[PDB]
Design a protein around this ligand. Structure first.
Ligand SMILES: COc1cc(COC(=O)c2cn[nH]c2)cc(-c2cccnc2)c1
Ligand SMILES: COc1cc(COC(=O)c2cn[nH]c2)cc(-c2cccnc2)c1
Lengths: 211, 205
């Protein structure tokens, strides 16, 4: 059973996740994903979520007073607070496996230049906090990263190396290209060895970093 | 200016998407029979189903041209990075083919590559149920680089200068750009070493 809370200034962006949830998983109480508009915790009539950076520079920084109030209300001592950021530790399949057993994830979606660092540092004095990157590219905000994280974790919750090689299905011949005959051979030891070699060759060509 | 076509059996997942136009297409629109079957069991055995080449071939025939960059997200792909985003930001036409089940028949990409440029790419070393979330990541990373639209970044701070008894580092309040530039450098180097030693050419933990 897992609760996921997402905090964002674009709550509609998280409409897809709540759709893709099977009804049976929700009714068996195995999962609950809730999305919260950050501006609910703003203090001023202009609903400000950001301000200029100390020390100057580009972009605005999200306000600690607003985030602090939000996390105070949503988090508990048992919460795993997830903060997507290009500056984070790498989020990998290992990470997804580990988090799939958590009772409560809270994902803080940041925008612009980032979130005042005191938010995470304060939170870390009473809960577990993980700043993570889903990849070495830059996005405008953490919302797309939240979708990726939610999907990678929840598909490892029951009910909710080398690269893989090519897959084939019917028909045996299509636009002049035949399925590799070994796959139709009924020699399953040989098929396994062909697939292993396919995997080795693909990994050398595409991901030599994994060797 | 850029056109992006996304092809998927779950088009409503792409809802959270005039310098660019983005169109989303239901792959089932190119099936011929009632059940609208898009997948079948893998030749050679294995787990899960494989998307059939026939449906994909018909969809891509209509949607792509020889100028098209066909993008296929897959955990088995070349890495999609910021360099990739820069490269694709000047393309006229991206088509993103979103797979489901355990994958797409390899002949779809192989056939496409006889007519156009094809890129199988991974957005990271984790596994998703389908390419749709990866498509959203790729679209965001690329569109923000479209004309008219290393080391890890260190910590950022804004007002107030003291919050819950936690002070903004004093150098950031000093107005000394040289001391500030140097402090930020030491922060970034320190963060990179700790979190991403691979970026500086060191062994991963
Ligand atoms: C909370 O701090 C953030 C968060 C994000 C969104 O996450 C990603 O882009 C990401 C997550 N894994 N890989 C990339 C982006 C920025 C940002 C944007 C532009 C310039 N500088 C910083 C800052
Ligand atoms: C077209 O072939 C695919 C595509 C995808 C979706 O993309 C990603 O998950 C992804 C993209 N970058 N990093 C990860 C997933 C699978 C798949 C799923 C489960 C088991 N095995 C394979 C296959």
């Amino acid at each position: 059973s897992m609760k996921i809370d997402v905090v964002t200034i674009f709550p509609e962006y998280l409409q897809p996740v709540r759709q893709s949830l099977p009804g049976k998983a929700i009714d068996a109480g195995l999962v609950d994903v809730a999305v919260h508009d950050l501006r609910r915790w703003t203090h001023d009539v202009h609903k400000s979520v950001d301000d200029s950076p100390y020390g100057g520079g580009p972009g605005m920084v999200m306000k600690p007073t607003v985030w602090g109030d939000a996390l105070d209300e949503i988090c508990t001592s048992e919460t795993l607070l997830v903060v997507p950021t290009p500056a984070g530790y790498p989020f990998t399949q290992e990470t997804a496996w580990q988090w799939s057993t958590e009772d409560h994830l809270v994902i803080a979606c940041g925008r612009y230049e980032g979130i005042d660092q005191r938010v995470a540092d304060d939170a870390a004095t009473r809960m577990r906090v993980r700043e993570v990157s889903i990849g070495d590219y830059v996005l405008n905000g953490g919302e797309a990263a939240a979708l990726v994280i939610i999907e990678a974790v929840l598909r490892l919750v029951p009910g909710v190396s080398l690269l893989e090689g090519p897959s084939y299905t019917r028909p045996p011949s299509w636009r002049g290209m035949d399925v590799p005959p070994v796959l139709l051979s009924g020699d399953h030891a040989k098929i396994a060895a062909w697939r292993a070699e396919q995997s080795r060759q693909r990994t050398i060509e595409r991901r030599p970093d994994l060797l």
